[PDB]
Amino acid sequence: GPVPSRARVYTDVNTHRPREYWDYESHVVEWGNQDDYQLVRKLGRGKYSEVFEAINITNNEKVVVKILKPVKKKKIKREIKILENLRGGPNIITLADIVKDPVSRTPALVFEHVNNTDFKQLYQTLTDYDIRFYMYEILKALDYCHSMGIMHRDVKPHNVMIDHEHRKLRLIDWGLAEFYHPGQEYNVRVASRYFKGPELLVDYQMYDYSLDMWSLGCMLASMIFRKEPFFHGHDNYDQLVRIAKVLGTEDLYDYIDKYNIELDPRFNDILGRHSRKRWERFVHSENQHLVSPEALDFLDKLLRYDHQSRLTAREAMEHPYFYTVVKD
Numbered sequence: 001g002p003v004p005s006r007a008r009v010y011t012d013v014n015t016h017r018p019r020e021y022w023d024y025e026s027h028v029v030e031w032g033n034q035d036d037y038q039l040v041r042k043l044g045r046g047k048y049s050e051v052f053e054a055i056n057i058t059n060n061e062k063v064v065v066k067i068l069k070p071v072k073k074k075k076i077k078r079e080i081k082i083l084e085n086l087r088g089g090p091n092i093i094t095l096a097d098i099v100k101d102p103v104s105r106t107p108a109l110v111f112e113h114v115n116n117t118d119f120k121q122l123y124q125t126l127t128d129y130d131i132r133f134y135m136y137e138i139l140k141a142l143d144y145c146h147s148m149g150i151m152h153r154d155v156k157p158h159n160v161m162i163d164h165e166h167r168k169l170r171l172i173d174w175g176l177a178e179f180y181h182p183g184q185e186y187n188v189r190v191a192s193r194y195f196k197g198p199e200l201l202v203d204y205q206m207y208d209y210s211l212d213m214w215s216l217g218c219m220l221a222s223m224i225f226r227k228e229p230f231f232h233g234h235d236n237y238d239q240l241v242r243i244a245k246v247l248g249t250e251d252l253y254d255y256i257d258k259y260n261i262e263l264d265p266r267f268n269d270i271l272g273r274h275s276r277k278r279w280e281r282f283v284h285s286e287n288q289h290l291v292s293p294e295a296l297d298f299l300d301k302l303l304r305y306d307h308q309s310r311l312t313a314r315e316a317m318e319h320p321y322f323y324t325v326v327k328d
């Protein structure tokens with residue numbers, strides 16, 4: 001059957017850590033005092049949680065409270081451990097506390113306040129300079145978590161929280177994140193549709209950090225071309241067709257052939273034959289100010305079928321695209 005695959009970076013990071021670092025199931029949670037926090041306003045509800053603006057009365061400071069809808073104790077211990085492991089890293093949201101909600105009878109995670117503005121609200125009106133700035137900020141977070149043996153697996157605009165006033169950015173919702181263990185098969189039902197990598201859409205389970213680099217490419221493509229979403233499928237099948245209509249079918253077959261993967265036969269009446277399009281195709285009078293040779297070279301190196309050929313976060317940080325961005 002399928003050919004095995006392994007990350008080309010940070011391959012062995014968890015194999016060398018102590019069990020406690022990755023054996024999240026065996027994590028003993030440390031509970032604070034729910035009384036410290038007063039909920040103020042419901043901000044959002046997803047499939048797995050409700051998010052509240054709250055205040056910590058024991059210091060008067062604003063926090064964000066995420067009350068975990070019941071899902072699976074593993075997934076709850078998973079997110080908590082990952083957040084503790086990544087706490088303090090560049091541009092990672094900071095878990096401040098964990099308390100029991102008395103009404104829900106479930107864990108509530110308390111995070112340090114971020115402004116109520118996700119990236120999707122602003123990423124379509126940014127200057128060329130700011131797209132690069134904020135991409136580099138996102139890259140800091142991704143390389144950090146990948147270096148720590150963790151893939152986010154749900155990179156998308158809504159999961160990027162941005163304080164555009166203070167030019168600050170946080171990567172949030174680590175509820176789908178997982179520890180990378182070389183040779184391990186993962187669930188392909190992660191990420192939002194538009195941001196799903198081809199590996200997920202062809203049901204290839206032995207994926208890695210590079211999945212996140214595909215989603216980041218989908219965000220970049222959407223910002224520089226002002227097309228939201230860039231790959232707009234009506235379902236998971238058409239999503240791959242949408243990608244094929246840009247990257248071409250010959251490279252898709254080369255990919256699945258490399259990994260000895262067999263597409264769903266559903267694809268035969270739907271996929272057709274498509275050439276690789278040149279990126280200049282998606283440039284027009286309304287986005288040309290956001291497009292440059294460097295942008296297009298960079299995007300090209302992110303948006304590749306073969307998850308092994310994509311730029312890593314760190315390589316992405318080296319790209320000439322970021323040379324105009326002032327570094328701290």
Ligand SMILES: Cc1cc(O)c2c(c1)C(=O)c1cc(O)cc(O)c1C2=O
Pocket residue numbers: 043044051064066093111114115116117161172173174175
């Ligand atoms: C509308 C909205 C506003 C937010 O501030 C957050 C979220 C949603 C959110 O989902 C979220 C998830 C999370 O894991 C950590 C957070 O700080 C958050 C958030 O902070």
Ligand SMILES: [Cl-]
Pocket residue numbers: 187
């Ligand atoms: Cl999962």
Ligand SMILES: [Cl-]
Pocket residue numbers: 009142143146209210311312313314
């Ligand atoms: Cl990486």
